[PDB]
């Protein structure tokens, strides 16, 4: 009868659904909207805060903030409202009747999952729950048991290698570069054309232009010379005001920041070198199967042409004897949630839920013991 | 003999002079006046053209237009006249025998400086030229080489940190709230007393009132209370016709907007928070020296008691052990130009000049190659 | 059973009524007439000053004076007479038993509201009162919560953009240009034909000529050639003494001052640009809803052809893909009063009054905190 609740709870955008389906029930941006003006028509829908889709359409008069920043929940009083809207409005199911599968990014601070579990039990009174790693679920959903997952969502990027279902914690690599860092770099590079987006309401328009026009290039210098040679890459986009902006060269300069974080004033290496070092950190015997099941996942990896670029870079980094396969599922935007659902539907997993009575024995710290 | 001119050309007030001097030779409010009434008498002077102090004098029958707005040259047919006037009528020297060092705010449209170089090399026929950022000039005008230049003109405000001569582009911050916005806010709040200023001519009167009697508060709420309780904080100004008006509470309400942009409805952060953020975007090993060598500049930071206010704000935001010192030179109103003249007297900057033939061989885009 | 009074008191016309009706109970010009002869037929109804309609029916022998010029009450003894005539002679109700909802223009001096409250609480001794922005009631009456109101009364023309009930006070625009200036400009342009109207009792005849014959041309530079080529555009008017005037070209040159204020010797932009700028001051997201919900109100917008010309202007000004719809109902001559009667009757409003107890506690300085 009862079924577990699978909530991705990823940074930037929130996904939720019931355990045992092939699609997340409800996806809504993790945005908390608050009015920054003072209403003059009282009684016509005055609410102290708008969450989710109502905080997207009304963004013209709202200040919008993200509860999760770089995978870390920065405002718990806002995460509580996001969770309440997820439970009681989008799914319209009480929490006291279903288990809840939260997901967390690797190498996240200690208090994060602790407060997650604490809020899950002390406020919503959930029967059972779990805190699974966001990356490992993608390999489950991919239909494999060996390989390295490259999960680049909105707040955190991370490459995690898994063999035979057991993860290798010593070779987990994390990178604070993410999709919101590309949005910010686009808000900077767009000024060279004569455009100014600085408002949180306009960051959403910048994000929409990004995931509609920008695309990774296969040879960045050759595409730069192509753009400088003849204007044939420019595209027209229409803002909600009706202006017709025109971004040309700026198409691939934004996604390229993934492979060269020096564009963002960061010291670390690109995503390709990140995956390469994460793989070469794995045991030598298993590497032969790793290079064959390199899987992309999450939102930000859905760039046009990212597959060929990743393959070229990793095969130029790895030796020629090795077989490089960048397997890119055509639905990798929800792979984390699909894998979470698959894992939650297992009878073997029906014993891995941290129960309430167990929570009462050792306090929230229990989450550090059960979850891997 | 032969020297290098220096034409700041900031918004609001255009400065110009010769390299080596300690003060710009010709400074004038960069406007263009146009008669809005039909002349009828013979003997009257020029038509369709009034530049600088000449326009300021006869503003009673003209409509005034600033060709620069928020740091971007909107109308080149007027900026060309501004340059012609500062070359032939104020400095009184042919522009075909001297290099020219222009200034531009960070994060501006590329076509702006492209057209700047094209006009310099195509109309006035200068031998060489160069365009620099105002911040780099300001720090080079303080004789320091390690500091965070907080510049605030009339149309732009920018915090630029520099350490050991290396500029960090990833932390350059530019807020658009500036002097003219404060002037507009003053025009709007003066209506409460009953003083209506709506003409572009009376905007000059309002600007003079602002820079003569407005002062920024140390504790805003306390100053508001004292102003509301007593009349010992009311000043008197005399309009040109001879009337005397009184400004009390407005005196510090006008500049307070620099720290609370919400007064203008601009949902953004203040200038002190902008400084703090531009610092926190730098490397952790250099934040203390930047905390120590904050230098101000521009005609929008001469309000009485602004250094102490910024110091209080930063100290409240910065860690306790870190020491805060607001270096506020009492010559900052021209500091950038001083920097301009300085950068024009170094044997190290006599080779960074964009030659005429260098422009001919590659076109106007060379400004991006040579100038940073 | 007590019902609030909605009393407009705008410049030119005062309209009073009870809260909860579909039309004002009593409308009369807000003039005060002083007799300018010394009549010796004593006992026949002689007075010292005639208010409202009684002045018009005698305007031949009176000097008519408007106590409200450009939205500001320049004479408070006369305004007390206007309010006393409204309370005891037009409505015939004691003021000490009903709350009073007055209206005011935006960006008026604070002394106006202060004295309005002081008079309504110390002279008429009302138990409660309120002061509302007119362009907000003009949206209340239209049955909306999102739109830009373009209220053009007899003495003042202001635009207020509202979205979802949250007003944007940083984009409220005001323009001191209305019926009274169009009537004083018609009094000037009528001299070209030979007609000389000078007395304050002939300004009313000119205002009648303007509100009965004048219209707004859809194309001024074409209608000028039309009225120049043929006499198929003239109209005749019969003065109250027999003489007949004829006006062919003045008909659309009178209201054309609304769109080209330079005709009156004013720098400010026309009403179409006043509305367009007030739209483009808002956020990029809500501009589409402000475009398609452009409301009109006030008597000055009761010109045949005002909506067509306003649409032709704001469409040539707005982006080519935005749909413009000038909401102009024929009941817009009194939309502000209908909005007032709607607001005063609501239940959620019964806590927004300024109670006599509140005024006794803080004096007239309270109207700034309560009234938006």
């Amino acid at each position: 009868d009862i079924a577990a609740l699978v909530v991705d709870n990823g940074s930037g955008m929130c996904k939720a659904g019931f355990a045992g389906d092939d699609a997340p029930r409800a996806v809504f941006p993790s945005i908390v909207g608050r009015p920054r003006h003072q209403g003059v028509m009282v009684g016509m829908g005055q609410k102290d805060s708008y969450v989710g889709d109502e905080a997207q359409s009304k963004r013209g008069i709202l200040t919008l903030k993200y509860p999760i920043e770089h995978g870390i929940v920065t405002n718990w009083d806002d995460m509580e409202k996001i969770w309440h809207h997820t439970f009681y409005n989008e799914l319209r199911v009480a929490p006291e009747e279903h288990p809840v599968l939260l997901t967390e990014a690797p190498l996240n601070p200690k208090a994060n999952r602790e407060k997650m579990t604490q809020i899950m039990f002390e406020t919503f009174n959930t029967p059972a729950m779990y805190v699974a790693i966001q990356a490992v679920l993608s390999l489950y959903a991919s239909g494999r048991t060996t390989g390295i997952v490259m999960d680049s969502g909105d707040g955190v990027t991370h490459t995690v290698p898994i063999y035979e279902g057991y993860a290798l914690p010593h070779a987990i690599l994390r990178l604070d570069l993410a999709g919101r860092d590309l949005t910010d770099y686009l808000m900077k590079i767009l000024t060279e054309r004569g455009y100014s987006f600085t408002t949180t309401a306009e960051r959403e328009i910048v994000r929409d232009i990004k995931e509609k026009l920008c695309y990774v290039a296969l040879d960045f210098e050759q595409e730069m010379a192509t753009a400088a040679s003849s204007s044939s890459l420019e595209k027209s986009y229409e803002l909600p005001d009706g202006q017709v902006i025109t971004i040309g060269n700026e198409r691939f300069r934004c996604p390229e920041a993934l492979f060269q974080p020096s564009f963002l004033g960061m010291e670390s290496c690109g995503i390709h070198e990140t995956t390469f070092n994460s793989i070469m950190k794995c045991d030598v015997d298993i590497r032969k199967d790793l290079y064959a099941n390199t899987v992309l996942s999450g939102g930000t990896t859905m760039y046009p042409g990212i597959a060929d670029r990743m393959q070229k870079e990793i095969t130029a980094l790895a030796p020629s004897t090795m077989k490089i396969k960048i397997i890119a599922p055509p639905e990798r935007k929800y792979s984390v949630w699909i894998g979470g659902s698959i894992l939650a539907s297992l009878s073997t997993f029906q014993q891995m839920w941290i129960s309430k009575q167990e929570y009462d024995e050792s306090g929230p710290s229990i989450v550090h013991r059960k979850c891997f | 003999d032969i020297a290098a001119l220096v034409v700041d050309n900031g918004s609001g007030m255009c400065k110009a002079g010769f390299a080596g001097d300690d003060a710009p030779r010709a400074v004038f409010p960069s406007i263009v006046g146009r008669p809005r009434h039909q002349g009828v008498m013979v003997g009257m002077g020029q038509k369709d053209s009034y530049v600088g102090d000449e326009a300021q004098s006869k503003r009673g029958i003209l409509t005034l237009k600033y060709p620069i707005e928020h740091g971007i040259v909107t109308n080149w047919d007027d900026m060309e006249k501004i340059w012609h006037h500062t070359f032939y009528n104020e400095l009184r020297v042919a522009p075909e025998e001297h290099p020219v060092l222009l200034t531009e705010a960070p994060l501006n449209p590329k076509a702006n400086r492209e057209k700047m170089t094209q006009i310099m090399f195509e109309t006035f026929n200068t031998p060489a030229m160069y365009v620099a950022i105002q911040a780099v000039l300001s720090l080079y005008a303080s004789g320091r080489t390690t500091g965070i230049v907080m510049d605030s003109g009339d149309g732009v405000t920018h915090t630029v940190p520099i350490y050991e001569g290396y500029a960090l582009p990833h932390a350059i911050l530019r807020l658009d709230l500036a002097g003219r916005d404060l002037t507009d806010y003053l025009m709007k709040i003066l209506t409460e007393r009953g003083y209506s200023f709506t003409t572009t001519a009376e905007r000059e009167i309002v600007r003079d009132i602002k820079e003569k009697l407005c002062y920024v508060a140390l504790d805003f709420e306390q100053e508001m209370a004292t102003a509301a309780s007593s009349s010992s904080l009311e000043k008197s100004y005399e309009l040109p016709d001879g009337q005397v008006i009184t400004i009390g509470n407005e005196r510090f309400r006008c500049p307070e907007a620099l720290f609370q942009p919400s007064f203008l409805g601009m949902e953004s952060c203040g200038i002190h928070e902008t400084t703090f953020n531009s610092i926190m975007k730098c490397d952790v090993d250099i934040r203390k020296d930047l905390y120590a060598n904050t230098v101000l500049s521009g005609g929008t930071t001469m309000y009485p008691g602004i250094a102490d206010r910024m110091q209080k704000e930063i100290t409240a935001l910065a860690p306790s052990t870190m020491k805060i010192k607001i270096i506020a030179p009492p010559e900052r109103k021209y500091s950038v130009w001083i920097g301009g003249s300085i950068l024009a007297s170094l044997s190290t900057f006599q080779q960074m000049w964009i030659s005429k033939q260098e422009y001919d061989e590659s076109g106007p885009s060379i400004v991006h190659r040579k100038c940073f | 059973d007590i019902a609030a009074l909605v009393v407009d008191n705008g410049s030119g016309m005062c309209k009073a009524g009870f809260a909860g009706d579909d039309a004002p109970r009593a409308v009369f010009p807000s003039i005060v007439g002083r007799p300018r002869h010394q009549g010796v037929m004593v006992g026949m109804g002689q007075k010292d000053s005639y208010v409202g309609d009684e002045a018009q029916s005698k305007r031949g022998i009176l000097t008519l004076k408007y106590p409200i010029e450009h939205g500001i009450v320049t004479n408070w003894d006369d305004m007390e007479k206007i309010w006393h005539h409204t309370f005891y002679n037009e409505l015939r109700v004691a003021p000490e038993e009903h709350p009073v909802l007055l209206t005011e223009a935006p960006l008026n001096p604070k002394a106006n509201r202060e004295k309005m409250t002081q008079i309504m609480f110390e002279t008429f001794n009302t138990p409660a009162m309120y002061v509302a922005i007119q362009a907000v009631l003009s949206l209340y009456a239209s049955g909306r919560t999102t739109g830009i109101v373009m209220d053009s009364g007899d003495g003042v023309t202001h635009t207020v953009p509202i979205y979802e009930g949250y007003a944007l006070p940083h984009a409220i625009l005001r323009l001191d240009l209305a019926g009274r200036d169009l009537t004083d400009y018609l009094m000037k342009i009528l001299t070209e034909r030979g007609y000389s109207f000078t007395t304050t009792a002939e300004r009313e005849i000119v205002r009648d000529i303007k509100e009965k014959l004048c219209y707004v041309a859809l194309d001024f530079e074409q209608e000028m050639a039309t009225a120049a080529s043929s006499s198929s555009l003239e109209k005749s008017y019969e003065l109250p003494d027999g003489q007949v005037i004829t006006i062919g070209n003045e008909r659309f040159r009178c209201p054309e001052a609304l769109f080209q204020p330079s005709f009156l010797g004013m720098e400010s932009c026309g009403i179409h640009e006043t509305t367009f700028n007030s739209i483009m001051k808002c956020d990029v997201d809500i501009r589409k809803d402000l475009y398609a919900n452009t409301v009109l109100s006030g008597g000055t917008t009761m010109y045949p052809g005002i909506a067509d010309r306003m649409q032709k202007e704001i469409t040539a000004l707005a982006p080519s893909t935005m749909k413009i719809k000038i909401i102009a109902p024929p009941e817009r001559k009194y939309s502000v009063w209908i909005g007032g009667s709607i607001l005063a009757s609501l239940s959620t409003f019964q806590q927004m009054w300024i109670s006599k107890q509140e005024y006794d506690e803080s004096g007239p300085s309270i109207v700034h905190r309560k009234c938006f």
Partner: peptide
């Protein structure tokens, strides 16, 4: 500016 803000 061209998009965003006036200039």
């Amino acid at each position: 500016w061209x998009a965003x803000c006036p200039a």
